[PDB]
Amino acid sequence: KQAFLILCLLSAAFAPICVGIVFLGFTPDHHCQSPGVAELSQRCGWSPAEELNYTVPGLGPAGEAFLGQCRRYEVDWNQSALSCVDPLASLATNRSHLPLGPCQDGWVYDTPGSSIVTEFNLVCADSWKLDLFQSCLNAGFLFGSLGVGYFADRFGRKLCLLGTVLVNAVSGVLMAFSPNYMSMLLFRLLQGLVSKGNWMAGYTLITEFVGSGSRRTVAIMYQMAFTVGLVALTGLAYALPHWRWLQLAVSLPTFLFLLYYWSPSFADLFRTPRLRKRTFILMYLWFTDSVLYQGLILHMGATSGNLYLDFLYSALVEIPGAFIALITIDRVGRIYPMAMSNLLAGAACLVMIFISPDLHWLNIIIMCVGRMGITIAIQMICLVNAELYPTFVRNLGVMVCSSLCDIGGIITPFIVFRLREVWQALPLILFAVLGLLAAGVTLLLPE
Numbered sequence: 001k002q003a004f005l006i007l008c009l010l011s012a013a014f015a016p017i018c019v020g021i022v023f024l025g026f027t028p029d030h031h032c033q034s035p036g037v038a039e040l041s042q043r044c045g046w047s048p049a050e051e052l053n054y055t056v057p058g059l060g061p062a063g064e065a066f067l068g069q070c071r072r073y074e075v076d077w078n079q080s081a082l083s084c085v086d087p088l089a090s091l092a093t094n095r096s097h098l099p100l101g102p103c104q105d106g107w108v109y110d111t112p113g114s115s116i117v118t119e120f121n122l123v124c125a126d127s128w129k130l131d132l133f134q135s136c137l138n139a140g141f142l143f144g145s146l147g148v149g150y151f152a153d154r155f156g157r158k159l160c161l162l163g164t165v166l167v168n169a170v171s172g173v174l175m176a177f178s179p180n181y182m183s184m185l186l187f188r189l190l191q192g193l194v195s196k197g198n199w200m201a202g203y204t205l206i207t208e209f210v211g212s213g214s215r216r217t218v219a220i221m222y223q224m225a226f227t228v229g230l231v232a233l234t235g236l237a238y239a240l241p242h243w244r245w246l247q248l249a250v251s252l253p254t255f256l257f258l259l260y261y262w263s264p265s266f267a268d269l270f271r272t273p274r275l276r277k278r279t280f281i282l283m284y285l286w287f288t289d290s291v292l293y294q295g296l297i298l299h300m301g302a303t304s305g306n307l308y309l310d311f312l313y314s315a316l317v318e319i320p321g322a323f324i325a326l327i328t329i330d331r332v333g334r335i336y337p338m339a340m341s342n343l344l345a346g347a348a349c350l351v352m353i354f355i356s357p358d359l360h361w362l363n364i365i366i367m368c369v370g371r372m373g374i375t376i377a378i379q380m381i382c383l384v385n386a387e388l389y390p391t392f393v394r395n396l397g398v399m400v401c402s403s404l405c406d407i408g409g410i411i412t413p414f415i416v417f418r419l420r421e422v423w424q425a426l427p428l429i430l431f432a433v434l435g436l437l438a439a440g441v442t443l444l445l446p447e
């Protein structure tokens with residue numbers, strides 16, 4: 001059981017890679033930096049809130065945070081004629097008539113730490129570039145899911161695994177030293193090429209080593225290790241407030257993992273109408289579950305008012321989800337539990353639309369229920385997908401079904417970030433529709 005610790009570490013360290021954007025890429029409050037505002041504030045003695053009151057454009061009806069975050073007044077603050085009580089009052093009849101311009105001189109972020117958003121200025125016009133951080137990782141996942149099988153077929157298995165683990169560790173450490181956004185994106189793609197391949201290889205090894213009398217228990221323990229990795233990520237993110245500090249502390253543990261040492265065809269899946277239907281349903285279920293999981297995590301990261309405690313509470317509820325899945329697998333079945341778990345997540349996403357922002361105590365409960373639901377659904381599907389295919393084409397079908405997860409991971413970040421700008425509740429509407437459809441579709445599969 002000595003190698004069990006390192007094989008579980010291989011899965012625990014995979015958590016910060018796919019979920020670390022919540023802490024490495026947070027967006028703090030910001031406004032246009034102005035050169036003459038600071039001197040006037042020191043002259044008059046403005047408090048931090050009074051400076052925002054007197055300088056940044058107001059919100060107005062319907063929120064409209066765009067005018068305050070991406071625009072500024074072009075008034076010459078260097079003029080001594082400005083009164084300390086209200087400098088904008090004597091300039092015009094109303095503040096709406098003042099000229100506006102972009103933040104030419106930069107931005108001011110109200111945070112003690114840092115992130116990729118604050119360092120690369122991924123705000124306003126460039127705000128879509130933050131979505132590329134996860135899309136590049138998921139494109140790397142998709143390409144690796146094809147490349148790694150070819151590499152392992154034409155090269156030594158153990159040497160290939162060692163090489164991929166070393167590549168992942170080196171790319172993770174190097175990304176903490178990235179000088180610009182393009183190199184960071186390239187390192188992210190390189191890391192995503194090998195991360196999921198290594199995770200799947202470790203899972204396959206740990207399932208092959210253990211006999212049939214304990215395969216399910218170890219498979220569940222593999223996800224328990226991911227949950228423990230999420231908890232450790234939350235702790236490290238609380239301890240290290242800078243994104244470069246957090247990135248090194250995430251990648252370095254995988255280095256000690258190496259330091260511890262020192263024919264089926266694609267056309268087959270759709271040749272039969274029943275097999276075609278099962279393949280389509282499994283593809284849709286994998287896509288829906290991946291979209292729901294990633295979107296819920298990103299939405300929590302983007303809208304929660306207490307990120308650390310919400311993330312900790314959401315991560316913990318996965319463990320009861322794993323226990324419930326384990327109890328329900330051998331007593332009830334696979335179709336009804338999966339349908340119920342998907343319906344629970346869909347209903348939780350639907351309810352969160354109407355909850356008022358001040359009812360945080362209920363919002364966190366609904367979020368935890370939804371996370372437990374998607375966790376149970378994923379645990380069920382990880383067995384349903386595998387056991388619904390014959391042994392001859394089981395692995396190829398599993399790979400094809402899992403590629404839909406990577407495609408959904410590619411698409412998801414633009415749904416959560418960009419579509420929320422059009423309307424805040426729209427991503428939740430999409431998630432509710434997808435969850436309800438997944439609940440409905442699941443019933444068609446045979447028991």
Ligand SMILES: Cc1ncc(C[n+]2csc(CCO)c2C)c(N)n1
Pocket residue numbers: 018222223224226227289290293294318322375378379
């Ligand atoms: C991005 C992403 N990461 C992991 C999983 C699957 N998964 C592995 S461990 C775990 C939590 C315990 O069940 C889950 C959901 C997924 N579907 N999407």
